[PDB]
From a paper:
The S. maltophilia EntB (SmEntB) structure was determined at 1.78 Å resolution. The protein core consists of a six-stranded parallel β-sheet (β3–β2–β1–β4–β5–β6). The cleft that is located between the lobe and the central core of the protein is part of the putative active site. Although a single chain is observed in the asymmetric unit, crystallographic symmetry revealed the presence of a dimer. Analytical size-exclusion chromatography estimated a molecular weight of 61.8 kDa, consistent with dimerization. In our structure, Gln79 and Arg88 interact with a formate, which occupies the same position as the ring carboxylate. Indeed, in SmEntB a water molecule is present in the same position, suggesting that the mechanism of substrate hydrolysis might be consistent with that proposed for VcVibB. Mapping the electrostatic potentials on the surface of SmEntB suggested that this putative isochorismate-binding site is mostly hydrophobic, but it is adjacent to charged residues. The hydrophobic residues of the pocket (Leu3, Phe42, Trp95, Tyr126, Tyr1552, Ile155 and Phe181) are conserved in SmEntB and other structural homologs, suggesting that isochorismate or other vinyl ethers may fit into the active site of SmEntB.
Clinical and environmental isolates of Stenotrophomonas maltophilia produce an enterobactin-like siderophore that promotes bacterial growth under low-iron conditions. In bacteria producing enterobactin-related molecules, EntB and its homologs are usually multi-domain proteins in which the amino portion acts as an isochorismatase and the carboxy domain serves as an aryl carrier protein (ArCP). However, in S. maltophilia the isochorismatase and ArCP functions are encoded by two distinct genes: entB and entB′, respectively. A crystal structure determination revealed EntB to be an unusual, single-domain form of isochorismatase enzyme.
Residue numbers in the entry: -2 to 210
Write the structure that this text describes.
């Protein structure tokens, strides 16, 4: 594999509740206001991790717990997925960092089986780091009365961070599942949660989120 030019991501432990940064914001998530986002959990982006070890194994198990939780409560579920064989003119500047992108292949495009979307769940075409850019995420959420977003997926310091700060700027309170995201390293993972906590959102563990939603 070579997504993000990484043949492999070395194993690292997910942060525990005691290791989370203090959120500057007072926002707390509510079942009737929140929407779940599963950010780019496609075979292409996950190949580099050892799926039997941390962080991916527990992160995938945690997104599966959040999907089951939302499906039992009518909480809207959104996924982002890029399409393969993007034209460089549409892919833009990210191609200068991460190459031409995934191919139109069953080894790249599909959301992994363990997190497969169900009928009635929105799968948005992902064009940029932020799930809101070149999409209708904001209007889909608004007309459903959802003004809170719970972010899960990969990579924490890139698309998850860009999506959180855009949600915040669009008046959508932003939450990130600290152990239902994964990244290039624990250092990148910690950096993402620390920056979100001081500027635009609230990192919480999956166990904490399941208890309050
Ligand atoms: Cl846009
Ligand atoms: Na490999
Ligand atoms: Na609240
Ligand atoms: Na409702
Ligand atoms: Na793998
Ligand atoms: Na691999
Ligand atoms: Na838009
Ligand atoms: Na509860």
């Amino acid at each position: 594999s070579n997504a993000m030019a990484l043949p492999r991501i070395t194993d690292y432990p997910l942060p525990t509740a005691a290791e989370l940064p203090q959120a500057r914001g007072p926002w707390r998530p509510q079942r009737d206001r929140v929407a779940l986002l599963v950010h780019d959990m496609q075979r292409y982006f996950l190949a580099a991790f050892d799926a039997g070890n941390a962080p991916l194994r527990p992160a995938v198990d945690n997104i599966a717990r959040l999907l089951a939780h939302c499906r039992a409560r009518g909480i809207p579920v959104f996924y982002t997925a890029q399409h393969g064989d993007q034209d460089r003119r549409d892919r833009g500047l990210q191609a200068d960092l991460w190459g031409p992108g995934m191919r139109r292949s069953a080894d790249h495009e599909p959301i992994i089986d363990a997190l497969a979307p169900q009928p009635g769940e929105h799968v948005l075409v992902k064009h940029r780091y932020s799930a809101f850019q070149r999409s209708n995420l904001e209007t889909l959420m608004r007309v459903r009365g959802r003004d809170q977003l719970l972010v899960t997926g990969v990579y924490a310091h890139i698309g998850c961070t860009a999506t959180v700060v855009e949600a915040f700027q669009r008046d959508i309170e932003a939450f990130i599942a600290a152990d239902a995201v994964a990244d290039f390293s624990r250092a990148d993972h910690d950096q993402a949660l620390h920056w979100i906590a001081r500027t635009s959102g609230v990192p919480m563990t999956t166990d904490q989120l399941l208890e309050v939603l």
